mmCIF file of C-alpha atoms and ligand atoms in Angstrom:
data_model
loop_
_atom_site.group_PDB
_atom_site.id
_atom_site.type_symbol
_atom_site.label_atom_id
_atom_site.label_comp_id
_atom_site.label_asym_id
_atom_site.label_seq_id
_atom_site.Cartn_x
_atom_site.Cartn_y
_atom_site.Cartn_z
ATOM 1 C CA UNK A 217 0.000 0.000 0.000
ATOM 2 C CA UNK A 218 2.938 2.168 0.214
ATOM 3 C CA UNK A 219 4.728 4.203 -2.113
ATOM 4 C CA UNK A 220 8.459 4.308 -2.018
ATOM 5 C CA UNK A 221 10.715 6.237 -4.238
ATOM 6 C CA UNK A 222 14.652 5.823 -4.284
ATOM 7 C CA UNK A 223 18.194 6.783 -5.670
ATOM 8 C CA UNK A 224 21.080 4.575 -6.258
ATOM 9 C CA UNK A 225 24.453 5.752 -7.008
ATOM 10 C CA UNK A 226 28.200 4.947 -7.536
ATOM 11 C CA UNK A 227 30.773 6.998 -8.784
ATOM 12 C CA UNK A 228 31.482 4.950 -11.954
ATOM 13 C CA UNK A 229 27.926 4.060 -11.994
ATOM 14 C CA UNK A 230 27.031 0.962 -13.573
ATOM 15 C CA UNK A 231 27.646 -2.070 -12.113
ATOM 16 C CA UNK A 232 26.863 -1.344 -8.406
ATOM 17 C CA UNK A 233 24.133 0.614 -9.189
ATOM 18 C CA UNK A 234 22.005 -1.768 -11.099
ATOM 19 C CA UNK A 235 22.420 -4.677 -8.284
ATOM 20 C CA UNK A 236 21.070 -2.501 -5.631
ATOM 21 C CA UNK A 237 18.078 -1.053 -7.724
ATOM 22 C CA UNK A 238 17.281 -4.700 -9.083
ATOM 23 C CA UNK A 239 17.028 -6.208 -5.060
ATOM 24 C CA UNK A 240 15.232 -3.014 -4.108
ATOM 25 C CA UNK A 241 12.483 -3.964 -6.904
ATOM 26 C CA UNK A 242 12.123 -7.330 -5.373
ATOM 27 C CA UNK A 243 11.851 -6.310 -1.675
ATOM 28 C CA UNK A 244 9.675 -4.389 -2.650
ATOM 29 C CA UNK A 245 7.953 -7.024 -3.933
ATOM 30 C CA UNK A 246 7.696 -8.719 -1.164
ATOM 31 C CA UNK A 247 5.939 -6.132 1.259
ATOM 32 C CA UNK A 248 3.829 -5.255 -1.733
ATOM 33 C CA UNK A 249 4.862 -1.641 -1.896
ATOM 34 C CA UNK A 250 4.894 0.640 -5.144
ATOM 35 C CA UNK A 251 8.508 1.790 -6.063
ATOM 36 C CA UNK A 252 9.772 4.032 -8.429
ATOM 37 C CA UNK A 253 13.873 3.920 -8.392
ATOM 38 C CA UNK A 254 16.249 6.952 -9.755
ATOM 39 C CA UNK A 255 19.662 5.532 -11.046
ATOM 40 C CA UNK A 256 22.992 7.947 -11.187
ATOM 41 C CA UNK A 257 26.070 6.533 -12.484
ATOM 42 C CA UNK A 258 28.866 7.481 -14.699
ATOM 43 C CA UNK A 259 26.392 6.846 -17.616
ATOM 44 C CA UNK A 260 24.229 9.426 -16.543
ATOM 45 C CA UNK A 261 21.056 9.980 -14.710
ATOM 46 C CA UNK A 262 18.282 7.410 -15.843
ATOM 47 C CA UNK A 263 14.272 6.866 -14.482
ATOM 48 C CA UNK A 264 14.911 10.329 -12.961
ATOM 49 C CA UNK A 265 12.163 10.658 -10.196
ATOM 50 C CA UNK A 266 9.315 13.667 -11.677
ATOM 51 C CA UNK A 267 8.842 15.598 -8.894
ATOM 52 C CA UNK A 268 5.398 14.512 -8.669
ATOM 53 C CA UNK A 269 6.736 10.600 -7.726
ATOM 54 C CA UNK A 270 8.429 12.404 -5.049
ATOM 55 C CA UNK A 271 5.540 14.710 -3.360
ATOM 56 C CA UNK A 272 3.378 11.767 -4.426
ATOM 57 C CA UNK A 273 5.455 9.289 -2.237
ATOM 58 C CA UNK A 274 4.963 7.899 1.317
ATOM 59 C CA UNK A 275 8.926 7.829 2.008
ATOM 60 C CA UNK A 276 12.260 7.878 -0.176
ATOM 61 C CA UNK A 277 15.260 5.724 0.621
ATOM 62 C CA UNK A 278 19.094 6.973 -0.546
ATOM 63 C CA UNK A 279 20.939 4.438 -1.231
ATOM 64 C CA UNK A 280 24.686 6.219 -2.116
ATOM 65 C CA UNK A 281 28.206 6.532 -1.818
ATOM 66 C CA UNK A 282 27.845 10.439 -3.470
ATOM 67 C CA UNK A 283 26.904 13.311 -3.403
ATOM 68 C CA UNK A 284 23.446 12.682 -4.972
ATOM 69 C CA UNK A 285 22.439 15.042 -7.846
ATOM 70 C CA UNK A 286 19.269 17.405 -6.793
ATOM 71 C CA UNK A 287 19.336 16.149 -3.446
ATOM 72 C CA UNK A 288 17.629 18.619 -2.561
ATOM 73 C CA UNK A 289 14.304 17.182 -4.069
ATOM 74 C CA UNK A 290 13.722 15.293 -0.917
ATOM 75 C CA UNK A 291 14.575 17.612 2.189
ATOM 76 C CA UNK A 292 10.719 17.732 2.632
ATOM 77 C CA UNK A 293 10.730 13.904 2.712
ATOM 78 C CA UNK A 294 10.646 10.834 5.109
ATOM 79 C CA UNK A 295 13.615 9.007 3.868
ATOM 80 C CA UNK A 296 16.597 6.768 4.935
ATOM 81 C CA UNK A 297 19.829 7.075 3.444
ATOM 82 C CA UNK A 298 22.593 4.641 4.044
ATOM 83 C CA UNK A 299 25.935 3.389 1.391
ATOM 84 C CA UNK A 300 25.486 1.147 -1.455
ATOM 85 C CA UNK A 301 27.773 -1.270 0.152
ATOM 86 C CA UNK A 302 25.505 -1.798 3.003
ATOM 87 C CA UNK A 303 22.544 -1.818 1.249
ATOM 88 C CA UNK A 304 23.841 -4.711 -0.530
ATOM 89 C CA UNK A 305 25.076 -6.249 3.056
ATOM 90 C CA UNK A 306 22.481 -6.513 4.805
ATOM 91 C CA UNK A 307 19.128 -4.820 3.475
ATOM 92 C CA UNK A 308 16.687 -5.773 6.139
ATOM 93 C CA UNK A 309 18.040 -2.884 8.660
ATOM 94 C CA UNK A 310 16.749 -0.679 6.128
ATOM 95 C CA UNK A 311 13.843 -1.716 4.770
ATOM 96 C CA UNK A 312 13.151 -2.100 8.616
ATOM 97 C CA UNK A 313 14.522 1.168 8.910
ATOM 98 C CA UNK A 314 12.104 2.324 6.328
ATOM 99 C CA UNK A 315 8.949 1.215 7.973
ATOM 100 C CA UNK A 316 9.836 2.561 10.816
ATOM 101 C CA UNK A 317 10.310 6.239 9.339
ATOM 102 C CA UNK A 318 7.516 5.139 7.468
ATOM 103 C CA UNK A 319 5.194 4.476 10.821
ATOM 104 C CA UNK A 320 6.933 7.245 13.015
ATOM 105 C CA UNK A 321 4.173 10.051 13.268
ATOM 106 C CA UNK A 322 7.060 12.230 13.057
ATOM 107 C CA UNK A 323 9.153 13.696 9.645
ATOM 108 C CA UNK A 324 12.346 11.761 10.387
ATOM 109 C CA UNK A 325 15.523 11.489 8.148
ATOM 110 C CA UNK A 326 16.955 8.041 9.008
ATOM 111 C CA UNK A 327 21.098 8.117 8.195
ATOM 112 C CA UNK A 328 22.316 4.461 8.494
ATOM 113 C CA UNK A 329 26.048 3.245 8.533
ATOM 114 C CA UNK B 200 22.463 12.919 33.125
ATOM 115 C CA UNK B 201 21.619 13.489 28.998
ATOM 116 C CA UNK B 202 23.372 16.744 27.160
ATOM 117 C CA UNK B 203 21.813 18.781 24.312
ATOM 118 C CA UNK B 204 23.729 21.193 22.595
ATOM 119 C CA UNK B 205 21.139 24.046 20.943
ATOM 120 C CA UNK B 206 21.371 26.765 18.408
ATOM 121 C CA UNK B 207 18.403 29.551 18.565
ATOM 122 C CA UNK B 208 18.602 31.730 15.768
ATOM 123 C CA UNK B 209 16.357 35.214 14.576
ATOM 124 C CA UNK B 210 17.230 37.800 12.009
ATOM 125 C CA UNK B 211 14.806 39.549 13.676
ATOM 126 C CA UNK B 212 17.278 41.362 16.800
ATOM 127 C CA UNK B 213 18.224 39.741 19.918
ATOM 128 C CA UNK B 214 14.728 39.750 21.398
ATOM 129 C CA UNK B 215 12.754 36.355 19.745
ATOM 130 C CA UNK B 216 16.099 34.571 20.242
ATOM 131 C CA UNK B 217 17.194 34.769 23.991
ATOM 132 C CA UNK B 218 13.665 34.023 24.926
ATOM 133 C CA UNK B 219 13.707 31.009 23.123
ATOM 134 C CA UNK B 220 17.231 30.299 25.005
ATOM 135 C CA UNK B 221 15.620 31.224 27.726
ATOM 136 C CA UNK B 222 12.811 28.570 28.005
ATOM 137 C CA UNK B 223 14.681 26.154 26.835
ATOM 138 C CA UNK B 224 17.158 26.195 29.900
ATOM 139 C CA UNK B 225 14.476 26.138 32.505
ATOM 140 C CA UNK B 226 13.093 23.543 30.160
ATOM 141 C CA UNK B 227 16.064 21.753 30.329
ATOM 142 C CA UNK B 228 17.183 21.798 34.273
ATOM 143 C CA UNK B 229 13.396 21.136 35.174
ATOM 144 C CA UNK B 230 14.167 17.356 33.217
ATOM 145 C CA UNK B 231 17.990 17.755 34.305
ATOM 146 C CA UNK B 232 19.857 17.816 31.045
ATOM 147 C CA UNK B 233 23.051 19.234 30.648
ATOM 148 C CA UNK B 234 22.744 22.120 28.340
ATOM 149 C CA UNK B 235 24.828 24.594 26.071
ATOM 150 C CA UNK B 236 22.885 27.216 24.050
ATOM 151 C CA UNK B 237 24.036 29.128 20.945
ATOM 152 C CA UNK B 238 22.757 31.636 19.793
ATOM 153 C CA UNK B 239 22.950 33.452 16.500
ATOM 154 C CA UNK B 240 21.343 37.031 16.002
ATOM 155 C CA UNK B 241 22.094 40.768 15.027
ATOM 156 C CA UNK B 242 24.657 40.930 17.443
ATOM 157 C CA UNK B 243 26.435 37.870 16.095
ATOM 158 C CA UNK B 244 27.452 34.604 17.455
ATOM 159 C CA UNK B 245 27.141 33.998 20.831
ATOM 160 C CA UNK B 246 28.713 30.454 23.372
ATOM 161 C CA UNK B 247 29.677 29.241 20.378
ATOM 162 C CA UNK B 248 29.328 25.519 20.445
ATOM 163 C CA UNK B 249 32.226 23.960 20.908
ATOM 164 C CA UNK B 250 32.689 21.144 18.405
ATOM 165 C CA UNK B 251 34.148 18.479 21.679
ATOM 166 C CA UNK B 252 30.495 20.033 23.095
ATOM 167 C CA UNK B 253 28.644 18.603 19.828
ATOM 168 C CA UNK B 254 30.533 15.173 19.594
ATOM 169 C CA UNK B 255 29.587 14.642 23.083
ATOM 170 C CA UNK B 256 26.153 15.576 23.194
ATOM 171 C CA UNK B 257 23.259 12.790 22.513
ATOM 172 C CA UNK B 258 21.366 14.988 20.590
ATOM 173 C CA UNK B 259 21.072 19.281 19.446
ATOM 174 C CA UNK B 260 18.197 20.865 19.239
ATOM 175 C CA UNK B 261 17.996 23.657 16.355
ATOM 176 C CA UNK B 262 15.200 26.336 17.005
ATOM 177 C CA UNK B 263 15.452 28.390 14.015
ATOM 178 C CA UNK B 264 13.645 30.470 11.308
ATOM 179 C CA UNK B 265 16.761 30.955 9.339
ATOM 180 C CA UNK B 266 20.224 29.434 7.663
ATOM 181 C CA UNK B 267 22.260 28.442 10.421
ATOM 182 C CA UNK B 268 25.838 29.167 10.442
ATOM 183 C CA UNK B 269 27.826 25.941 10.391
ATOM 184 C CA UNK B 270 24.767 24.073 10.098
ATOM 185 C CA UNK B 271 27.447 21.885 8.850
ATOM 186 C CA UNK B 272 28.216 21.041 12.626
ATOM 187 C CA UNK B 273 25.356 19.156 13.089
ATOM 188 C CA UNK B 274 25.371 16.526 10.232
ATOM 189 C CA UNK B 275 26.265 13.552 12.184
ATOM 190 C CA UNK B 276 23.898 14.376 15.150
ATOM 191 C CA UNK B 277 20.424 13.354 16.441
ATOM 192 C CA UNK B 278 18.886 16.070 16.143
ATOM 193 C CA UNK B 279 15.284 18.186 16.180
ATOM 194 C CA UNK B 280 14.996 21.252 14.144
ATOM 195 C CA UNK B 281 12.296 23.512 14.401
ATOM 196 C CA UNK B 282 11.072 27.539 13.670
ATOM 197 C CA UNK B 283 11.457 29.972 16.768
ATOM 198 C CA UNK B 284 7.710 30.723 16.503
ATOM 199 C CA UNK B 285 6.896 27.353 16.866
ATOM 200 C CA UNK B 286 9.192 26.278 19.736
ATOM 201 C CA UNK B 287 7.722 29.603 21.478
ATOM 202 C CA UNK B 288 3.608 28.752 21.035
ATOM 203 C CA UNK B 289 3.985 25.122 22.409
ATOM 204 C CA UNK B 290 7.563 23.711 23.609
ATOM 205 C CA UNK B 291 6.358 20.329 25.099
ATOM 206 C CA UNK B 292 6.130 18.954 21.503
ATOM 207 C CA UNK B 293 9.354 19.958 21.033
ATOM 208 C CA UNK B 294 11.277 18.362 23.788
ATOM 209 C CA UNK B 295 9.377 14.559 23.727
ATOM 210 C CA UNK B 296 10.171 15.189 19.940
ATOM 211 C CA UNK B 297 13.770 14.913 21.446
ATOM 212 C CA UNK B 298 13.351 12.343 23.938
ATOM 213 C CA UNK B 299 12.611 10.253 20.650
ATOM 214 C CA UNK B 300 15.657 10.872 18.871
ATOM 215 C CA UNK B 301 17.358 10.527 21.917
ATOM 216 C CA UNK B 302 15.901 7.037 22.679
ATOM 217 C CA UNK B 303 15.205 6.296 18.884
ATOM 218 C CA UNK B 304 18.085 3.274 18.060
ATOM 219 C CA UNK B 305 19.590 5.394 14.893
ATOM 220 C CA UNK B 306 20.892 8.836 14.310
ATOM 221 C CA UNK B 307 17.478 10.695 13.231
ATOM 222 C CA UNK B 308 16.800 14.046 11.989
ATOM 223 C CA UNK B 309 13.794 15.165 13.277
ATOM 224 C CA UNK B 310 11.854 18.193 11.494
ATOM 225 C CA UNK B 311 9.024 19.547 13.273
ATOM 226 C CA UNK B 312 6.491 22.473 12.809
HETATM 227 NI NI1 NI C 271 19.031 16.053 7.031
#
């Protein structure tokens, strides 16, 4: 029932970035959520978030190592952003981590690792 | 036996700021937390956090309207940011807003009204 938009992004930006937008798809998947997933890479940035996915979404999760281009599309967002390596390591943190900024009645920016 | 570290911060004079400061460190001995208060206003900047002050306290607590000077300090704190105005009309939300991200596991940002 929720809606969940997200970045990935590596420096080089194409190999890393693909993995961790592929398992995001299929977690969410599993907790039946609706996901739309930015991807910023040394190729360039590709299914760049409209700002409407963004106002329209429940919370946003950052998944980087970088400075992420127009981050400041989601200051007035619930969101959790942790690295792509840890992501990758061990994912359940986070998308723990994201329902619980998802449930907390307050606006909270989650940073993990 | 908990320490916040605070910034208040008004273009507007040194009048809305000090009374901010002001309730928040009767707010702060009533629940006996260790407090240091910084203030930013026409007059400049005031008890200056120091940055051993920041990297030892569990959490700040940013009551401002405006751009905080080294806002940069605070990037790897829990923290709850919020307008003077606001923390003036009702302060209670503000402070179990920071007994959250105190007891909250992770480093949260906290926005409030
Ligand atoms: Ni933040």
């Amino acid at each position: 029932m929720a809606y969940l938009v997200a970045v990935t992004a590596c420096v080089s930006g194409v190999a890393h970035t693909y993995m961790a937008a592929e398992r995001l798809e299929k977690l969410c998947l599993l907790e039946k959520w609706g996901v739309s997933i930015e991807t910023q890479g040394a190729l360039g940035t590709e299914n760049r978030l409209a700002d409407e996915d963004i106002r329209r979404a429940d919370v946003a999760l950052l998944i980087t190592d970088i400075e992420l281009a127009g981050a400041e599309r989601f200051e007035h967002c619930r969101y959790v952003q942790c690295s792509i390596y840890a992501f990758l390591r061990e994912p359940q943190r986070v998308m723990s981590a994201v329902r619980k900024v998802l449930s907390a009645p307050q606006q909270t920016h989650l940073i993990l690792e």
